[PDB]
Design a protein around this ligand. Structure first.
Ligand SMILES: *P(=O)(O)OCC(C)(C)[C@H](O)C(=O)NCCC(=O)NCCSC(=O)CCCCCCCCCCCCCCC
Lengths: 241, 72
């Protein structure tokens, strides 16, 4: 048994079995990947995403909790639950607040190849992701779906190179440890790179990324990560087609 | 003014005296730079002029003249 309720669902499910109540929430329903379920719902017009598993909600919940400890901007979780006589085959749920207004970074950079952004805005975004991912990894969380589309740029204010905030989302497969093994670090870095092959990153936008990501001199990175970087460049070539 | 800014950056970047920063000097053999320094130089240029240099252009910046030509 694991259960954490926060507002508004703490009162909403007071004398209620919350595992029943999540199944009773309503709204635009989505993915039904074998027992799993995602749906958007509103409480006083707020908007929350409901993920029910009947792999479970634990992955997202511990990533979200570690990222909050580490100061990495992400979803806020207002409800979470696990129960089951078989600790392997648990019934779980997690409800996260909606982040809005936002535009994810793939959409935002959709057509940088042809509509080039301000250079300083570009480099600030490249670096802001380098910081978050680095921060994520140093805090013991590897994403497993580390793509630019899972980073939200916040549009509640005008966006400039000097003022913008990101949030990382979709942690449904995220693994949380006290230290992120290097193989898992590299998978995220690989995936983040392949998601970004089509936005006009110069060779130097990528070195900028690596420096900020590792927080080590560029010369050391290119030496000690040589094989990783050569592999990523080789995969990225074939993926370009 | 711009024609001088480029000369100043190459010097602050490559750690060479302003007198050695001649339009004929290639960074690699004349100003003691290696590979990466040129790239860090190209980056420093991008950042000082708040611009972006495409990888095709930046690989043609191998001399001081090459550097000034691009900014103008
Ligand atoms: P000399 O010392 O002989 O050689 C010089 C040099 C440049 C070091 C050498 O030739 C070399 O090693 N490579 C040549 C070209 C180059 O610049 N390579 C380095 C960059 S490519 C790389 O390192 C492999 C993968 C890139 C790293 C990942 C990028 C992450 C990007 C994701 C950002 C997300 C944000 C997007 C905004 C919406």
């Amino acid at each position: 048994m694991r259960l954490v309720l926060e507002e508004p669902f703490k009162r909403l499910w007071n004398g209620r079995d919350p595992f029943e109540a999540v199944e009773a929430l309503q709204g635009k329903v989505y993915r039904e990947l074998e027992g799993r379920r995602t749906l958007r719902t509103e409480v006083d017009g707020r908007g929350y995403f409901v993920k029910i598993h009947r792999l479970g909600a634990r992955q997202e919940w511990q990533a979200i909790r570690r990222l909050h400890e580490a100061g990495v901007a992400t979803m806020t979780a207002v409800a979470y639950g696990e129960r089951g006589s078989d600790p392997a085959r648990q019934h779980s749920f997690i409800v996260t607040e909606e982040l809005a207004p936002t535009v994810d970074l793939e959409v935002f950079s959709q057509d940088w190849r042809e509509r080039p952004p301000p250079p300083r805005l570009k480099r600030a975004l490249v670096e802001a992701v380098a910081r978050m991912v680095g921060d994520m990894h140093r805090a013991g969380v590897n994403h497993r779906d580390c793509y630019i589309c899972h980073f939200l740029l916040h549009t509640d204010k005008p966006v400039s190179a000097d003022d913008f905030r990101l949030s990382v989302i979709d942690l449904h497969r995220a693994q949380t440890r006290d230290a992120t093994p290097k193989r898992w670090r590299n998978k995220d870095l690989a995936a983040l790179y392949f998601s970004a092959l089509d936005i006009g990153l110069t060779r130097r936008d990528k070195l900028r990324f690596l420096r900020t990501y590792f927080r080590r001199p560029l010369r050391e990175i290119l030496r000690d990560e040589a094989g990783l970087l050569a592999w990523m460049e080789r995969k990225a070539e074939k993926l370009y087609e | 003014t711009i024609e001088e800014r480029v000369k100043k950056i190459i010097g602050e970047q490559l750690g060479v005296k302003q007198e050695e920063v001649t339009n004929n000097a290639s960074f690699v053999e004349d100003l003691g730079a290696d590979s990466l320094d040129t790239v860090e130089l190209v980056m420093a240029l991008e950042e000082e002029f708040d611009t972006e240099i495409p990888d095709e252009e930046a690989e043609k910046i191998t001399t001081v003249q090459a550097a000034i030509d691009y900014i103008n």
